[PDB]
Design a protein around this ligand. Structure first.
Ligand SMILES: Cc1cc2nc3c(=O)[nH]c(=O)nc-3n(C[C@H](O)[C@H](O)[C@H](O)COP(=O)(O)O)c2cc1C
Ligand code: SF4
Ligand code: SF4
Ligand code: SF4
Ligand code: FES
Ligand code: FES
Lengths: 227, 439, 156, 74
């Protein structure tokens, strides 16, 4: 296909959505609810770009790039001012109830929400009201649960249920009291439950074994190895 | 006012003792003759063509054409498992019409099911009804039992060979279930999260099968079209919206109620003739044309026909055409605070702008109620109204949520500005750190 | 422990006959358990999950999604007053104040003897007769704050 | 400047000369004074969302009490 991003022409696969097509080219669009292996659901409303109808269009329309196909001759803008303002607004809305926890959070320096808060350029807090809180569950020896940090992006339930085929992790509740976890305290029964520590873009699901002897990602000495 | 069958096709067979009309009385008052004609002399495709040519639009608030919705169904004969759903949820505040039309005329709804299911080639039909309408559920189940006893439902209906089964599904009390894709999700026993479109329910709806969702009033308009013809329905009103509509005013008026009126009837006509105007010592201030999810309009907009395009060009929506009248002594900030509390607790929680931005507006409106508003709060409400519009959120709950807020800010900004009585403070002084005194 | 009775299981199975997927009877199964017991206890989620063949997480998500499925114990009668916009214009605040003064509880809480539980609800579809209030099966309209004690007395 | 809890501070003291270079490696008991230093009232755990002893969920600054999903309110 052929897409025009910010006046520049790119050749992308037409079967792809706009978010994964633009991420493949190296363009930075913030995203939370989308994952390459899980598909697109359009929940978090973070991947907004402005799609124009043709080349000589000025108004445009804010669309979600994860839900928009990368069809031939598609004109979009990522760095438009309205799209940037909407993406910063979505980050701010996620930040209204987020806890003041980054120093004592195992995902600090490893957090997709931190990266997308910085990437949208949102750093000034003008929300002044109470933040909703939550009580945590015991998920067993491996996964630590901290529901305060949730941005309600549905990656955990989509992975664990639709992808991994697990049955003991769902979304419960309503309007903004959505809760993610098990119906009761207990060990997560999936053999692939540990991938939640990387599927979750926040510090809700964390590696408890890493948490007992914790260090940040910049302090790690890594190597490529085989399990 | 007398009601002839020609100008009141939905309410002429009502009873004066507010009692339901059962099968014998319904058949005596020209019942199931449109269904008999449609199922014994008409192909489904020409019934869909008759509905499309009659200009029947949806009565659920969207105003979409019913025939064009029915024409989105696939032409393939391999997909023969098809569903007709009735949005009897009626959870929008200010709406009280489907309760009346299902408690008093259930067989009109059943006949509409029969005709629309035969037209859609839909083998099953479900009435997604809210759980607070106990009498409507009892009457609908009794009507379905009577129609099954009379051979109008089940297998081999009236000798045609069309098999159709009708169920009543009582809901569990959530407003978002009224959204058609969320209605499909709640019918499947899931959390009523709405679905993205495309694909539409006509292609893959209930359990992935072709499925058409229609309001109670649309399916009650269907039998009159099939019984009295198409040109009769087109010649009800001399307007671009064909047929009649259940309209009416509610709230601090002399005679709040529901009346069947042709399209193009002005709202001042309804208020000053059927509602009887405002009560004693009350000055009319504002009005919502179509329930809680519509923009407020002022008294200057009262001389306006209750059509879709006329209300839409005024900066609102016709909606369910059940107007609510707000008098002078009701504070606009308190009214919008109540509306936003409803909309922010009836969110489904799927998408971030509704889920995390309606509660922010609720808290801002609570602060403006208490006189604890701070500068920038009205700007935050305006930015929320601009960023919760169509396409920004996953479904249309949040645009309908922010319509009253932006309309009340547009027409009654002085009260919101009167809510702001304290300086903006987001931080507290930390002893030892000098603050960054921004200008 | 929890155990479904025979009548509850028969009603759930008969509701499962009405749909081509047994998951679609989850809302009605929760409502059946709620009718028989006043609310849905913790073991009822797993019991309904075992009957329907769906995960208990799905049943719990449905049970906590919908407002009229009670996952906490309630009183013998659920007072549900409409707090929506038309009843706000018609003055439900007097009704709520009268109910709070008569029952000596906050909304969402239950009295000491378990007689009434006070809950705000959404619009009851009776806006032309507001303010409305739905006790267990009966909707009461044209309410006034002086008629609350005479209306609550008939619900023993 | 990096500390989000105001734990680490530089005092007005300069007399730190030593005989052995190994004795210039100050462990935690050599650094942890018995008071608040230059910032006398800031408490990070009074602001953090994470629960510790004496401070449950919802007891931090600008936090509401947690609402259970089983609660009867709509
Ligand atoms: C938030 C929301 C709530 C809705 N609630 C209802 C409802 O309670 N009843 C209804 O008939 N339509 C409701 N609708 C409209 C439906 O999406 C749909 O248009 C309608 O049920 C069927 O379309 P029709 O008007 O062509 O019959 C709602 C829409 C939204 C966005
Ligand atoms: S989840 Fe991310 S943003 Fe939230 S406290 Fe942890 S590191 Fe900070
Ligand atoms: S727990 Fe994590 S993965 Fe799940 S919805 Fe919340 S932020 Fe997303
Ligand atoms: S706008 Fe979003 S969160 Fe709100 S009801 Fe619709 S899909 Fe759900
Ligand atoms: S990444 Fe597209 S809406 Fe979430
Ligand atoms: S607003 Fe209360 S019954 Fe509709």
């Amino acid at each position: 296909a052929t897409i025009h991003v910010d006046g520049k022409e790119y050749e992308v696969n037409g079967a792809d959505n706009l978010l994964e097509a633009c991420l493949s080219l190296g363009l930075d669009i913030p995203y939370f609810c989308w994952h390459p292996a899980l598909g697109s659901v359009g929940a978090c409303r973070q991947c907004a770009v402005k799609q124009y109808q043709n080349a000589e269009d000025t108004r445009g329309r804010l669309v979600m790039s994860c839900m928009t196909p990368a069809s031939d001759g598609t004109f979009i803008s990522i760095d438009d001012e309205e799209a940037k303002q909407f993406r910063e607004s979505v980050v701010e809305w996620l930040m209204t109830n987020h806890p003041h926890d980054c120093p004592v959070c195992e995902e600090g320096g490893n957090c997709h929400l931190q990266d997308m808060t910085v990437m949208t350029g949102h750093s000034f807090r003008r929300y002044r009201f109470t933040k909703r809180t939550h009580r945590n569950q015991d998920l067993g020896p491996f996964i630590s649960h901290e529901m305060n940090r949730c941005i309600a992006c549905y990656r955990c339930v989509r992975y664990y249920k639709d992808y991994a085929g697990g049955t003991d992790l769902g979304v419960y509740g309503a309007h903004d009291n959505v809760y993610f976890g098990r119906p009761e305290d207990g060990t997560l029964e999936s053999e692939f439950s540990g991938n939640l520590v990387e599927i979750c873009p926040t510090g809700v699901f964390t590696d408890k074994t890493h948490s007992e002897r914790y260090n940040r990602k910049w302090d790690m000495q890594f190597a490529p190895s085989i399990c | 006012i007398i009601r002839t069958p020609e100008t009141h096709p939905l309410t002429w067979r009502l009873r004066d003792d507010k009692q339901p009309v059962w099968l014998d009385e319904y058949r005596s008052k020209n019942g199931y003759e449109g269904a008999r004609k449609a199922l014994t002399g008409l192909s489904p495709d020409e019934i869909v063509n008759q509905v499309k040519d009659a200009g029947l639009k949806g009565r659920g608030g969207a105003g979409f054409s019913t025939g064009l919705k029915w024409s989105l169904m696939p032409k393939d004969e391999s997909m023969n498992i098809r569903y007709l759903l009735c949005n009897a949820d009626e959870m929008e505040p200010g709406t009280y019409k489907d309760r009346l039309l299902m408690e008093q005329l259930p067989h009109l709804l059943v006949e509409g099911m029969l005709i629309s299911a035969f037209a859609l080639k839909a083998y099953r039909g479900y009435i997604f009804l809210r759980g607070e309408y106990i009498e409507a559920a009892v009457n609908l189940r009794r009507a379905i039992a009577e129609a099954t006893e009379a051979g109008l439902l089940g297998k081999n209906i009236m000798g045609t060979g069309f098999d159709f089964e009708l169920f009543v599904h009582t809901g569990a009390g959530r407003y978002i279930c009224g959204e058609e894709t969320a209605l499909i999700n709640s019918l499947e026993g899931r959390r009523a999260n709405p679905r993205s479109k495309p694909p539409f329910p006509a292609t893959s709806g209930a359990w992935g099968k072709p499925t058409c969702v229609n309001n109670v009033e649309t399916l009650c308009n269907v039998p009159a079209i099939l019984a009295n013809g198409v040109e009769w329905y087109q010649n009800i009103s001399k307007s671009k919206d064909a047929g009649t509509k259940l309209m009416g005013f509610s709230g601090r008026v002399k005679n709040p109620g529901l009346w069947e009126l042709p399209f193009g009837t002005t709202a001042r006509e309804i208020l000053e003739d059927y509602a009887g105007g405002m009560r004693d010592g009350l000055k009319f201030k504002a009005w919502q044309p179509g329930g809680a999810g519509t923009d407020f309009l002022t008294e200057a907009h009262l001389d306006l026909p209750m059509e879709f395009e006329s209300i839409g060009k005024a900066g609102s929506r016709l909606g369910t055409a059940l107007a609510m009248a707000v008098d002078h002594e009701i504070n606009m900030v308190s009214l919008v605070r109540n509306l936003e509390e409803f909309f922010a607790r009836e969110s489904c929680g799927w998408c971030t702008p509704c889920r995390d931005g309606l509660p922010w507006s609720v808290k801002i409106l609570r602060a403006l109620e208490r006189g604890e508003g701070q500068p920038g709060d009205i700007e935050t409400l305006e930015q929320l109204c601009r960023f919760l519009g169509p396409g920004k959120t996953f479904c249309a709950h949040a645009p309908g949520a922010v319509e009253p807020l932006q309309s009340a800010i547009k027409y009654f900004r002085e009260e919101f500005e009167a809510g702001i009585k304290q300086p903006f403070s987001n931080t507290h002084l930390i002893n030892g750190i000098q603050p960054n005194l921004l200008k | 422990a929890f155990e479904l009775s025979a009548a509850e299981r028969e009603a759930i199975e008969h509701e499962m006959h009405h749909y081509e997927d047994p998951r679609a009877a989850s809302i009605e199964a929760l409502k059946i358990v709620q009718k028989q017991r006043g609310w849905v206890p913790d073991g009822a989620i797993h019991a309904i999950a075992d009957v329907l063949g769906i995960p208990a997480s799905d049943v719990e998500g449905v049970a906590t999604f919908y407002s009229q499925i009670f996952r906490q114990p309630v009183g013998r009668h659920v007072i549900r007053y409409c707090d929506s916009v038309v009843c706000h214009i018609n003055g439900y605040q007097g009704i709520q104040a009268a109910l709070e003064k008569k029952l000596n509880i906050k909304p969402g809480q239950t009295t000491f003897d378990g007689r009434f539980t006070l809950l705000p609800t959404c619009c009851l579809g009776n806006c032309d007769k507001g303010p409305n209030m739905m006790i267990d099966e009966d909707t009461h309209a044209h309410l006034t704050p002086e008629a609350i004690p005479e209306l609550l007395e008939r619900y023993k | 400047e990096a500390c989000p809890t105001t734990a680490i501070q530089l005092t007005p003291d300069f007399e730190m000369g030593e005989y052995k270079r190994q004795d210039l490696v100050y462990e935690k008991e050599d650094l942890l004074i018995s008071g608040p230093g230059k910032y006398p009232e800031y408490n990070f755990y009074r602001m953090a969302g994470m629960a510790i002893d004496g401070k449950d969920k919802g007891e931090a600054e600008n936090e509401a009490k947690p609402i259970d999903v089983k609660s009867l309110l709509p």
